[PDB]
Every structure is written in structure tokens, then in C-alpha cells.
Structure 1
Amino acid sequence: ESADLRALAKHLYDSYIKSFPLTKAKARAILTGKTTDKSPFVIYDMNSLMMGEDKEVAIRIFQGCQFRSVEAVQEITEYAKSIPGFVNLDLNDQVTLLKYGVHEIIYTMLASLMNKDGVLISEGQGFMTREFLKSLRKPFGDFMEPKFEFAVKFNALELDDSDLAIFIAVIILSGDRPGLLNVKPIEDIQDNLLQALELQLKLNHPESSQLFAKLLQKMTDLRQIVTEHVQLLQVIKKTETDMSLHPLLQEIYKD
């Protein structure tokens, strides 16, 4: 049964590597100056942003964020389908779980791209500083800061990709999403994923059941970040009428 849980952990890690082209391993190699990977161009003000290439800045960056979130949804959906039992659930419930899980997973994976000083962009080819993002016209200057605050706390856990692979699967398989039809089979899958994560942490860390506990708490941080984020989106919708969310993102955010 431990063996079943190890097999589940390995299946998930394999799918994660296959689904997500920029891993924490690669992000940390880029950020810490390892010779496996290359150095990013750093955008820290308006001039270096202009040089960054090769209708205002805040809006331009936001449309970029939108493009990469759309791709992330695609990657996460591919990953979700590999979680044993997911594709056998009622279709309505598959959609509900993805709708609520996608952004919580986005914030989780975004942390891998961040340190306290900024975030990797353009597949790790650029690095945009936290202070630059903060300087952006209101309320765009408020978007990324809560993500940074979360990322710094999440990254202190020092998880690697193999831990994250199971953690993300646990997120998607939440039986407490609004509007679910059959909660029991979702919870049955999550119970196994939770045990797989528990054992994975037990083998890989350091005070593992406490790490387990601290990691599970991050869900709450995640759902709070999402709530605060949609509120910001509502402001944007009202003040920037020449702008709207990509149809996929609109659908995710609808109710």
C-alpha cells in the first residue's frame, strides 16, 4: 500500500514534468546562477523595460499575464487528466474542479518563479523586479504584491517538483468546491493523493507531518489570494472598458 502510494507519486511526477515546461528545478537554476541554465535580462524600470523588447505599460504587462495564464490553464488541464480517476468523474464535476483549481495552482507554480525581489518572465528569459511591478499605475500596481507575499512564505517550505506534483493534484481534487454533483468519488481520490503526499514528504523532508500540515494550510492562503484577485479584476473591468479577460479566463472567473 506504501508501494501503491509510491507508484502514485512517481506517476504524478512524470506527468508534471511532461505537462509543465518550466519547472522549479529550472527556475532555481536560472535564478541562482547555475551553469545548467542561462542568465535572465532584468527589468527594473521603464528604460530597461523598453530595452526588454528585443497600449500603456501597465495594460501591456497585463495582456501578457493573460496570455501566459491561458497557456497555464492548458498545461494544468493536461496534468489534471493524468490524475488517476479524474477523467472518470462526471463531466460537470471535472469542469467545476478545474474552474476553482486552476488559479490556486497558478499561484503555487508562480511561487517557483519568484524570490523576494522579482519574478521570471518569458520562460525564464526575463526577470521583472517586485519594486517595478509595485510602481505600476493603480490598481495594476497592486496585482502582483499579494502573490509575492504568498510566494516568499511558500518558498520557505523548500518543496521540490516531486512534492509539488502531488500537492497540485490534492488542490484539484477538492470535494468542497461550490456546485459539485458527486462529492464522494472526488474525496476518495483526494484521500489517496493526501496519503501519497504524506509519504512523499516523510521520505524527502525533515519534520514531515509538520511540513505536511504547513503545506495543507497554504490552500487557505490560496483561496484568499484568489478572492482578493477577482475583486481587483472587478475594478479593472469597470475602469478599463477597452479591456477584457480572454474568453477562457472570463469563463473561469464567471460566478
Structure 2
Amino acid sequence: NPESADLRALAKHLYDSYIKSFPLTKAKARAILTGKTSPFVIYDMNSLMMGEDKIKKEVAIRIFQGCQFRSVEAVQEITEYAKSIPGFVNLDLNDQVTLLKYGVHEIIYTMLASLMNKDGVLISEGQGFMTREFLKSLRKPFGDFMEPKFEFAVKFNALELDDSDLAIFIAVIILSGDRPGLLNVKPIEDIQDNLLQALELQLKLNHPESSQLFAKLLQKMTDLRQIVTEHVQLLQVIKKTETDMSLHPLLQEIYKDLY
């Protein structure tokens, strides 16, 4: 019960910190996508054109770079969140850097799911919606860059997690003892073990009807690793065909010798 209390207090701390760290939450995204509050819809080139006035070189490059710029803002928010996870800033600084390098894209994809449905994605802080079909229409090699993310999101969203759940799950992901090059695995696994028990208790309290949710969520962590792998490869291709396209230097730091 004092442990129970501690675990609930940890869940609460992380939820509070998540809210502070991430302006566009799942609750906020769901309210927008279901009308409880509509986004300008971009479904083709003409609507993209009309969209540029209403909300905020070649189109496919502009959209891809838009995705990168949004990722950069997510890295910032995730880094702030990570600093609030009890124990994190007390780790070896080399290890903190390794945990962020490998963790940030997995979190990006997790949280991107909140903004997605099977037909498209919220953009521009919820002021626009870009259709999946439109993102598939872009020229090679950009035609498919979002499809792995959509596929993940549709499956992930079927678990009906809320932000209080997500706050604990993303903490678990960052505190992964199996990242390459970690110097002190045991303190990381110790923190993750607390987070995992917090997660288990949260899901039991918050999703009593979902009998195997904890196990299902652990599997998603593994799935996240593959989208990242596939994304980095996709970037290799693009770095080949598109030598003139500037990449974002923060992302270059993250991607350098990643996998």
C-alpha cells in the first residue's frame, strides 16, 4: 500500500510532466478530430495551395522537410519530458545522451499516433489535416515516407490508451537498458523496473476491461524499433537521390551512427 501509493504517485508525476511537456496531447487531438470544440483539409495540390494561405521549391521536398521540422520540435519536448523522469538526470551523462538518441524517434512515432486516424494526420498544431492518400501521392522517393507511421498508428490507436497511460509508456521506452553503447545498464533497468510496475498498475486501474493490455503494450515497444530502422533506411535513399536537400542538424546528430 505504501508501495502502491508510491506507484500511483509516480504515475501522477509523469502525467503531470507530460502535460507540461507536450502541448498537443491525445485528448486535445481527439477533441479536434471528433469536432468536440474544424481543421483545413489538404487532400491534393489545389487544397495544399489554398491551405498555405488559411493556415501556416518543390512540394514533395517541402512536405518532407515539414515533417523533419516537426520532428525537431518533438525532440525538444521529449528531452524536456525525459528530464522529469525520476532518476534520469542522475544517470551518467553519456548514458542520458545514448537513451535520448535511440529513444526520441520511438516516442515521436508513439505520440504521432495520437494525431492520426486511418485517413490522415493533424498538422500545424491541429489547424490542418493532411490526408493519407495525399501523402501517398508524392513523387518517388517521398511517396511512401508516412505509410509505416500510419500503419503503426492504426494498430496502436485500437488499444485506446489515454494520455495518463502514454506518459508512463513513453518513460518506459526512454529507460531501455538495451540501447547500444550504454555504460551502466543496471541503474537504467532499475528505474525501468519501477516504471513498468507503475505502468502495470495504471493499466489495471484505467483499463479493467482490457485483460491483456500490459502485454500488448510491451510488444508495441519492439514494433517501434522497426519503424525507426525503416525510417533511417528511407533517409539513406533520399540522401542519394536528393543531394541538394538540406537536412536538419539536430536530426543529423541523432541519426549519426544510429543503427
- TM-score band by shorter chain is over 0.9
Q: The residue matched to 1:141 in structure 2 has which SS?
A: coil
Q: Does 1:11 align with 2:10?
A: no
Distance 1:71 1:79 in 2: 13
Deviation of 1:60 after TM superposition, in Å, equals 0.4
Deviation of 1:208 after TM superposition, in Å, equals 4.8
Distance 1:182 1:250 in 2: 25
Q: The residue matched to 1:58 in structure 2 has which SS?
A: helix
Query: After superposition, what is the alpha-carbon deviation per residue over 1:10-36, rounded to whole angstroms, capped at 9, x for unaligned?
Result: 000000000000000000000011139
**Partner in structure 2 of residue 127 of structure 1:** 129
Deviation of 1:207 after TM superposition, in Å, equals 4.7
Report if the CA contact (8 A) 1:198-1:208 is conserved.
no
Deviation of 1:220 after TM superposition, in Å, equals 1.3
Distance 1:233 1:35 in 2: 37
Report if the CA contact (8 A) 1:97-1:173 is conserved.
yes
Query: After superposition, what is the alpha-carbon deviation per residue over 1:148-207, rounded to whole angstroms, capped at 9, x for unaligned?
Result: 000000000000000000000000000000000000000000000000000000000035
Q: The residue matched to 1:53 in structure 2 has which SS?
A: helix
Q: The residue matched to 1:42 in structure 2 has which SS?
A: strand
Distance 2:172 2:139 in 1: 36
Report if the CA contact (8 A) 1:99-1:252 is conserved.
yes
Deviation of 1:66 after TM superposition, in Å, equals 1.3
Deviation of 1:243 after TM superposition, in Å, equals 1.1
Query: After superposition, what is the alpha-carbon deviation per residue over 1:96-117, rounded to whole angstroms, capped at 9, x for unaligned?
Result: 0000000000000000000000
CA pair 186-77 structure 1, distance change in 2 beyond 3 A: same
Q: The residue matched to 2:211 in structure 1 has which SS?
A: helix
Query: After superposition, what is the alpha-carbon deviation per residue over 1:200-244, rounded to whole angstroms, capped at 9, x for unaligned?
Result: 000000355610000110011100100111010000111101113
Deviation of 1:136 after TM superposition, in Å, equals 0.5
Distance 1:141 1:22 in 2: 26
Query: After superposition, what is the alpha-carbon deviation per residue over 1:59-108, rounded to whole angstroms, capped at 9, x for unaligned?
Result: 00111111111110000000000000000000000000000000000000
**Partner in structure 2 of residue 94 of structure 1:** 96
Q: The residue matched to 1:128 in structure 2 has which SS?
A: strand
**Partner in structure 2 of residue 46 of structure 1:** 45
Query: Once structures 1 and 2 are overlaid, which stretch shifts more, 170-179 or 209-218?
Result: 209-218
% of aligned pairs identical?
100
Alignment counterpart, residue 146 of structure 1, candidates 137, 145, 148: 148
CA pair 205-178 structure 1, distance change in 2 beyond 3 A: same
TM-score by length of 2: 0.96
Distance 1:244 1:233 in 2: 12
Query: After superposition, what is the alpha-carbon deviation per residue over 1:103-136, rounded to whole angstroms, capped at 9, x for unaligned?
Result: 0000000000000000000000000000000010
Report if the CA contact (8 A) 1:237-1:244 is conserved.
no
The alignment's C-alpha RMSD in Å is 1.1
Query: Once structures 1 and 2 are overlaid, which stretch shifts more, 108-117 or 133-142?
Result: 133-142
**Partner in structure 2 of residue 223 of structure 1:** 225
Distance 2:140 2:187 in 1: 44
Report if the CA contact (8 A) 1:198-1:209 is conserved.
no
Deviation of 1:245 after TM superposition, in Å, equals 1.9
CA pair 185-209 structure 1, distance change in 2 beyond 3 A: farther
Distance 1:43 1:179 in 2: 42
Distance 1:245 1:218 in 2: 29
Kindly tell me the number of residue pairs found equivalent between the two proteins: 252
Report if the CA contact (8 A) 1:174-1:187 is conserved.
yes
Distance 1:209 1:11 in 2: 25
Gaps of 5+ in 1: none
